[PDB]
């Protein structure tokens, strides 16, 4: 089997991408944030505290003839940005782009933090990291991909995120028309539950490539590119007037600037992020200070190849017995 679904930016900045997902019988379609940095499939629901729902589409398990309470199971998750959600668990039929999993754990939110309530465009998350990170207790649950894997033509999924445009998540096959050149594969460590890999270095604009190992995670659920402070300082030093602002929370730059590209290494291959992908617009409406798309990871504990980096590539998440990641230009 295979599946193929379009993923669409939630706003003009590509802050996140939503993909329609069919849950239950008859189908209830919710727009979920596919997140290769977490491993829970959770949804706004008929059980979510009413004051914490503001425009999201909800899953109502009582209206699904295939829903079954997973008795005793609860979940609770906290994300790197400080947001969180928790609740109970149903199993139900879940389909993405024509690919169907029966008995998928659908984690129904009873509580969500304010950042989720305030984003009416995201109806939940669909985790695509390794199932060892799934938060369901007392019986940990498998991700959608883990449940589908055995049925897929090939045990892979691909992320092809658009710049200011829709893109595609495919399951079970690699669309050879969706990228240019060749795909370069690189080793993955699953020891922390993430799609963790080591970039071979970077360049700023037309500058020389610096060969240096940068361990980080491929994370579709994080907007920006978070790298070591040395790398980030070298980037922003090439933008006149750019500076790190403690009050804003990161590097800002004059909106009148033209940003240089940023290149990262994948083995001997190179992925170029155009400068325009690094512009996240005014810090507040009408401001001439703009927020940068490359930020320091120093306060995180891990480097994160988020959407800013991933949308410059066609990315293969290879879930074979020994997982690997592939990157191609496009």
From Swiss-Prot:
It catalyses: Hydrolysis of proteins with specificity similar to that of pepsin A, prefers hydrophobic residues at P1 and P1', but does not cleave 14-Ala-|-Leu-15 in the B chain of insulin or Z-Glu-Tyr. Clots milk. It comes from Cryphonectria parasitica. GO terms for biological process: proteolysis. Belongs to the peptidase A1 family. This is Endothiapepsin. Disulfide bonds join 255-290. The keyword Disulfide bond applies. The active site is at residues 35, 199. Its EC number is 3.4.23.22. One of its GO terms (molecular function) is aspartic-type endopeptidase activity. Residues 17-328 form the Peptidase A1 domain. Keywords: Aspartyl protease, Disulfide bond, Hydrolase, Protease, Signal, Zymogen. It is an enzyme of class 3 (hydrolase).
